[PDB]
Design a binder for this molecule. Structure first.
Ligand SMILES: *Cc1c(COP(=O)(O)O)cnc(C)c1O
Ligand SMILES: *Cc1c(COP(=O)(O)O)cnc(C)c1O
Ligand SMILES: [Mg+2]
Ligand SMILES: [Mg+2]
Lengths: 383, 384
């Protein structure tokens, strides 16, 4: 780990060995103990249910976190939303990459078809039979093999096909196409993941499972039984795991957590951040103005995070409240005037994935010290 | 100059100079260089016609190259920066006059601030707490540099700054007395009113801010601390500061690029300011990557390619399709006529330019269908 050329407080927030009080704000810290407990717990859950877990790299965009998910959580590989992101993971040594998305632009397809030359195994999703010919041609050009998932729109309304006939058509084309292998089904119900009610989420996944089952049966009737039936997120994984239809999970956010996931309820009606998953990702911020008696202004505003899923909150205390932000300022209510200039706070971000994607580093803290500083390997890699 | 050898199109840069616009990799940010230059000239000409300095705000674009264009074509007198690390990026890029339009309190940040004049930059910083003066002076003394001081007034935005003329005078006196500091004037930015729809509502808010600033100027003058600069103003207010007789420096930022949330506010003729006053120069370029449903297209620019803090982007230059939804790596475009095909490209006007610029590392400057420039977002992610 050589950080030569970097400058703390200019292009990196900290270096291994620093005390946490020396970290430059605003930045992202990882509670390494809690991260590791989250990773172990999901890996144990998947194993106990006979499920593969392909950890989702779109969330943290970090080769180092993915390697920890593989070593400590038994993750079988990484999921990626974009080809450039996939390539960042493959260049970092990740050996099994699933692009949980469609790739259609010719230069993107060419880059995808080259990726296996890194030594990584590569699978991609398809929702348009016309895409098969392009992928096959590119794989033939580079002398590579690509795996194919057919993506089913099982309720999220994004990409994917909506009938079992469409699924069979794409799978048949994949099987017949040179240098492609039909590997199974992508069916991620992303739209239901943040419903507060466990029973509501169960009902949505019940419907997805029934649709996926019709597709599995149609494929089996054609001699194209899907090796993998892959999906599931931090708000649903128990349902895919109990289904006997899915055999691979794609959970991402559980490792870090955020406020929007944290507030949804488990089967007992308890917030999932109050027992199921721990907060491991925080924005560290400093108070930099307090001219009014009961308002503190901190240095983490919009550009240090996102607000697509609401505001962050101050972690570990309930006497102050993050209520507003502009681009480079956050306004924290301080009704008892207990915050002072240069005090530090930890914020749980509203939404982990976009927050991670506006930073270049994670400061991994343990026992009050900076133990690791990990690059956000795939930040901004949306091509 | 930029060295592109470390980068790779389609992996960590969207394009290279000389490419055809059809070859640009999506999602990315493009700048219509003609429109950008017309916006920059127009603001510069407006400022000069009103005898105002314009200090272009670098927090918006975070680009040394755009700032240099604002100086060369718009007559910008210098840059505004919101954070010390952003200021360091601009000073290291050769920008000669840097105002940090924010307070700097953390000791290591102050130490970094105090070294910035060694780049050749003149450096000014804002103060809203008299106790900050001693820390700034100590660092400047330690490193043999000079720092200028603006006292920040909360003139209605309710962010940083002080709210009494007595507090202003106290800070200014301390700056004047402190070694290696010089009291340079007032920071008074009414950011909260900038996006009110009604020009009349905006005028009234700035009337109140001007009155408060004038009282502070009067109090300073009575103490022998007349402010050399009285600086503020944004893209939604600049005509008020420019006709106030009190402000002498503007800090407009967004006008150069524009976005949807600014574009929708109305001018004194009841028109959207993006329908006459300022042109759209910043676009998100995006490709259709799925069309499995007959009347929906999915594009490759979602939340991670922009922001939604100020609402959705919109499709520019056509009326037959509509960006209605986005997830992290997808945008959903209504296509009720079924005219969009996979790999078609669309230009989106971002909802909010500043946060959108801060999630990308490059601007693809296009002119006459070609990539003329590829400029780095010099200060992306520099929030320290
Ligand atoms: C983002 C994503 C996941 C992981 O989702 P979480 O809700 O973050 O756990 C899984 N599958 C796909 C296809 C995704 O896009
Ligand atoms: C952002 C900002 C400006 C410029 O704002 P626009 O509304 O984008 O033109 C000016 N002054 C300060 C202090 C700012 O923070
Ligand atoms: Mg998410
Ligand atoms: Mg703005």
């Amino acid at each position: 780990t050589d950080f030569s050329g970097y400058e703390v407080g200019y292009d990196i927030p900290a270096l291994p060995g620093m005390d946490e009080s020396e970290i430059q704000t605003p930045c992202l810290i990882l509670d390494l103990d809690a991260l590791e407990r989250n990773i172990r717990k999901m890996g144990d859950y998947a194993k106990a249910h006979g499920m593969r877990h392909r950890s989702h790299g779109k969330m943290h965009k970090s080769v180092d976190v993915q390697k920890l998910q593989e070593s400590l959580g038994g993750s079988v590989g990484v999921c990626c939303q974009k080809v450039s992101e996939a390539e960042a993971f493959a260049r970092g040594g990740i050996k099994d990459v699933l692009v949980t998305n469609e790739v259609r632009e010719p230069a993107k397809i060419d880059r995808l078809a080259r990726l296996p030359k890194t030594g990584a195994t590569v699978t991609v999703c398809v929702d348009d039979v016309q895409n098969i010919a392009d992928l096959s041609a590119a794989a033939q050009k580079h002398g590579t093999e690509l795996g194919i998932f057919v993506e089913i729109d099982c309720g999220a309304g994004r990409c994917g096909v909506t009938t079992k006939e469409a699924v069979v058509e794409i799978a048949k084309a994949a099987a017949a196409a040179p240098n492609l292998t039909f590997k199974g089904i992508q069916a991620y119900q992303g739209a239901m993941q943040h419903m507060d009610s466990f029973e509501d989420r169960k009902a949505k996944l019940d419907a997805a499972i029934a649709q996926v089952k019709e597709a599995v049966d149609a494929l089996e009737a054609e001699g194209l039984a899907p090796e993998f039936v892959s999906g599931g997120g931090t708000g649903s994984y128990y349902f895919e795991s109990n289904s006997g239809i899915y055999n691979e999970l794609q959970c991402g956010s559980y490792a870090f957590m955020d406020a929007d996931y944290g507030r949804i309820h488990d089967a007992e009606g308890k917030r999932i951040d109050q027992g199921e998953w721990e907060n491991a990702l925080f924005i560290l911020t400093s108070v930099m103005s307090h001219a009014k008696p009961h308002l503190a202004v901190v240095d983490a505003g919009l550009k240090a995070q996102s607000v697509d899923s609401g505001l962050p909150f101050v972690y570990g205390r309930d006497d102050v409240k993050y209520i507003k932000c502009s681009d480079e300022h956050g306004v924290v209510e301080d009704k008892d005037g207990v915050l002072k200039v240069n005090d530090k706070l930890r914020l749980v971000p509203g939404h982990c994935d976009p927050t991670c994607n506006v930073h270049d580093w994670y400061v991994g803290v343990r026992n009050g010290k900076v133990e690791t500083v990990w690059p956000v390997s795939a930040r901004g890699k949306g091509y």
